[PDB]
């Protein structure tokens, strides 16, 4: 399956694309504001993410540091990045069908469209200011909106136990991006799209 990752934003982004323990394609890549980056992701990649990283430095061997969304020091990214991170996310080819959501549940950097290319479903975005909007005790001082758990390390928070309910800050969240899962337990905003669907993520895709 290809995604298309676009910058629309007027600031450069290095994108990240991981399954947790393993990069998807390369991994990650400068982006400058209006460059398009398309990778090709395995069928059947279960648990895989893309999200933009701001404000990195790399070194000739790609080794360097983010101040959002670092995946360990490296330009090609193995690993989930360090929040605060939008997160586009997806599972393909599960059972027949694709899921693909937006997750504010490690907090937000960067506004985000998530959309298919081909047919049969509709995309989800998280585009409105979070971070200029952040809850004082959730700005992240290194950039971006910290979600809660990152901030407070509470069961509540971070729903350990498995029992947990919306709180003050993941309604901020869903108030902002109603599409977006704000907590573990959200309603779910996940899209069903057809298995093998193609796909384009768009960072900053409104003025």
């Known amino acids: 399956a290809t995604f298309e990752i676009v910058n629309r934003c007027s600031y450069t982004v290095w994108a990240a694309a991981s399954k947790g323990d393993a990069a998807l394609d390369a991994g990650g890549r400068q982006l400058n504001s209006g460059e398009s980056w398309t990778i090709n992701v395995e069928p059947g990649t279960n648990g895989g993410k893309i999200w933009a990283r701001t404000d990195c430095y790399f ?112 309604r901020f969240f869903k108030r902002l991006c109603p599409d977006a899962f704000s907590y573990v337990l959200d309603k779910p905003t996940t899209v069903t799209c057809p298995g093998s669907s193609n796909y384009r993520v768009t960072f900053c895709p409104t003025a």
Not at 87 to 116: T, W
Request: with cysteine; aromatic share 8%; hydrophobic share 25%.
């Open 59 to 170: 070194d000739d061997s790609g080794s360097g540091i983010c101040k959002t969304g670092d995946c360990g020091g490296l330009l090609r990214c193995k690993r989930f990045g360090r929040p605060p991170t939008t997160l586009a996310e997806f599972s393909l080819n599960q059972y027949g069908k694709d899921y693909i959501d937006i997750s504010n549940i490690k907090g937000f950097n960067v506004p985000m469209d998530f959309s298919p290319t081909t047919r049969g479903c509709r995309g989800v975005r998280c585009a409105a200011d979070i971070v200029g909007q952040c809850p004082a005790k959730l700005k992240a001082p290194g950039g971006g909106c910290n979600d809660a758990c990152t901030v407070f390390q509470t069961s509540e928070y971070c729903c350990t136990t498995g029992k947990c309910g919306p709180t003050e800050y993941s």
